[PDB]
């Protein structure tokens, strides 16, 4: 029933075995001056088969803790 958060982002490093780090980009607004400013957050997600490669735009979903800092799992590779 209840679904879990899903994010789409580019892969910025895959040197780890079966792990890819996904860079999700957002635009937070300055609380006083109101301007839109870029915000990048790197997500450590599980890559079981090493299918994802550095550069491709992938989709990840939140899971239970899988490692010290891995909390997400790769769902599909939207683009490459």
């Amino acid at each position: 029933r209840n679904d879990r958060k899903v994010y789409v982002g580019k892969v910025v490093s895959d040197k780890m075995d079966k792990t890819i780090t996904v860079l999700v980009e957002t635009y937070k607004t300055h609380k006083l001056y109101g301007k839109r400013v870029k915000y990048s957050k790197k997500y450590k997600t599980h890559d079981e088969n090493n299918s994802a490669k550095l550069g491709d735009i992938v989709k990840i979903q939140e899971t239970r803790p899988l490692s010290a800092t891995k909390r997400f799992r790769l769902v599909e590779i939207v683009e490459e």
Partner: protein
């Protein structure tokens, strides 16, 4: 280089109004044409013509002066800018000069005035103030 054609058009109008010129030729664009048509409909300018020439096209505005040569356009102010963009909700639409002026707005229902935005209950990017 050029960074805000809407601001350039408003400043052309302001300078021509100051010098009490009659007409005004500026490079054309769809947003500029809609702004000019709104100005004509509201009564701040006398007329608008479009010249579909080569390149970009041209907008030819004809300004309106009241009796005693009084200027109908008191002032134009760019509100949303490339360096900082301003949007407003329907319930937060501003009243220019307590209602005596118009705020040109860009909405999902076309670029309209603040009166129309409030009536249709929509918001959008507040392009400019004209009073």
């Amino acid at each position: 280089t050029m960074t805000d054609p809407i601001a350039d058009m408003l400043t052309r109008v302001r300078n021509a109004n100051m010098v009490r010129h009659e007409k005004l030729e500026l490079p054309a664009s769809n947003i500029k044409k809609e702004i000019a048509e709104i100005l004509k409909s509201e009564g701040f300018i006398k007329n608008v013509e479009y010249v579909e020439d080569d390149k970009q096209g041209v907008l030819r505005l004809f300004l309106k002066y009241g009796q005693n040569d009084e200027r109908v356009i008191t002032g134009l102010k760019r509100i949303s800018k490339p360096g900082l963009r301003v949007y407003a909700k329907a319930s937060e639409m501003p009243k220019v000069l307590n209602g005596l002026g118009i705020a040109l707005v860009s909405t999902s229902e076309g670029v309209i005035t603040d009166k129309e935005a409030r009536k249709r209950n929509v918001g959008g990017e507040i392009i400019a103030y004209v009073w």
